[PDB]
Amino acid sequence: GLRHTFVVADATLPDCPLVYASEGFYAMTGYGPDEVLGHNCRFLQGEGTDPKEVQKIRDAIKKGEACSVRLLNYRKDGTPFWNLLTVTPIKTPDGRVSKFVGVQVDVTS
Numbered sequence: 001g002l003r004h005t006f007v008v009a010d011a012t013l014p015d016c017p018l019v020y021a022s023e024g025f026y027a028m029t030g031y032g033p034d035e036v037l038g039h040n041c042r043f044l045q046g047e048g049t050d051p052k053e054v055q056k057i058r059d060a061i062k063k064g065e066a067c068s069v070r071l072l073n074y075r076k077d078g079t080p081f082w083n084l085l086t087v088t089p090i091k092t093p094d095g096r097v098s099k100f101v102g103v104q105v106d107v108t109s
């Protein structure tokens with residue numbers, strides 16, 4: 001259907017580093033795995049990113065809730081694009097969040 005990208009962040013480490021990304025994610029951002037794995041997703045943010053929206057994801061992750069926000073992101077080459085991002089918490093049977101999964105859609109239309 002729509003062209004989306006998928007990533008997995010590890011919530012067992014304190015700053016939710018990305019541990020897996022689909023091919024589309026590298027193709028869309030221009031970054032390779034050597035610059036994506038082990039890092040927090042926020043490197044895709046830049047000057048025009050709305051901090052009110054960034055705030056919503058920071059809070060949702062801290063509370064372990066799903067969240068869906070519209071962010072201005074930037075490719076490796078500096079060019080911007082509109083990222084419709086949905087984060088989902090993945091809990092273990094004991095309620096603890098283990099991973100956050102993210103679906104990212106380039107909605108620049």
Ligand SMILES: *[C@@]12=NC3=[C]C([C])=C([C])[C]=C3N([C][C]([O])[C]([O])[C]([O])[C]OP([O])([O])=O)C1=NC(=O)[N]C2=O
Nearest residue numbers: 009016040041042044045054057058100101102104
């Ligand atoms: C990013 N995708 C993305 C995917 C997952 C699974 C998670 C947990 C986060 C993201 N982010 C945001 C970033 O990691 C961070 O959570 C937020 O910026 C809020 O906290 P900070 O520390 O920045 O205040 C994504 N951010 C993007 O800009 N683009 C994505 O694709």
